[PDB]
Amino acid sequence: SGWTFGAGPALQIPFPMQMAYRFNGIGVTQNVLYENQKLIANQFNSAIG
Amino acid sequence: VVIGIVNNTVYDPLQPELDSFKEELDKYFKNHTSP
Amino acid sequence: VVIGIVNNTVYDPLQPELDSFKEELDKYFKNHTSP
Ligand SMILES: *[C@@H]1O[C@H](CO)[C@@H](O)[C@H](O)[C@H]1NC(C)=O
Ligand SMILES: *[C@@H]1O[C@H](CO)[C@@H](O)[C@H](O)[C@H]1NC(C)=O
Ligand SMILES: *[C@@H]1O[C@H](CO)[C@@H](O)[C@H](O)[C@H]1NC(C)=O
């Protein structure tokens, strides 16, 4: 759901489109995520490990 | 490079805004060349 | 009035946007005035 579950009915949204919607808050545009998608995924995985 | 991108048409507004005038420009020229 | 401003050219995209038709417009006028 994302941030919506904490402010109303809990609406649904795919996770690869709920991180392209959080780069925008930082300042970097969203396209960067899709263009690095796979790479970023691996990094995140390694991070948790 | 992006996964899940879906085919469609994008209605770039600037073109029909021009094309609203580009449709009438070409027709006018041909009439004046007729004589 | 500003300090540190630097001379350069600003690529106004709308100008080539209209030039995409203006060039062939000049071509059409060349055809218009050729005979
Ligand atoms: C969405 O997920 C399903 C199963 O997880 C998969 O079969 C489908 O291909 C996915 N959609 C896209 C666009 O990859
Ligand atoms: C989109 O259209 C292009 C050209 O018509 C085609 O090559 C491509 O396979 C299409 N992709 C999808 C997902 O429909
Ligand atoms: C910028 O260009 C203008 C005219 O092209 C000129 O008068 C002026 O001296 C130039 N300024 C600098 C800092 O180059």
Curated annotation (Swiss-Prot), chain A:
Job description of the protein? Subunit of the fusion protein that is processed upon entry into the host cell. Mediates fusion of the virion and cellular membranes by functioning as a class I viral fusion protein. Contains a viral fusion peptide that is unmasked after S2 cleavage. This cleavage can occur at the cell membrane by host TMPRSS2 or during endocytosis by host CSTL. In either case, this triggers an extensive and irreversible conformational change that leads to fusion of the viral envelope with the cellular cytoplasmic membrane, releasing viral genomic RNA into the host cell cytoplasm.
Q: What is this protein called?
A: Spike protein S2'
Q: Which organism is it from?
A: Severe acute respiratory syndrome coronavirus 2 (2019-nCoV)
> What is the taxonomic lineage of the source species?
Viruses, Riboviria, Orthornavirae, Pisuviricota, Pisoniviricetes
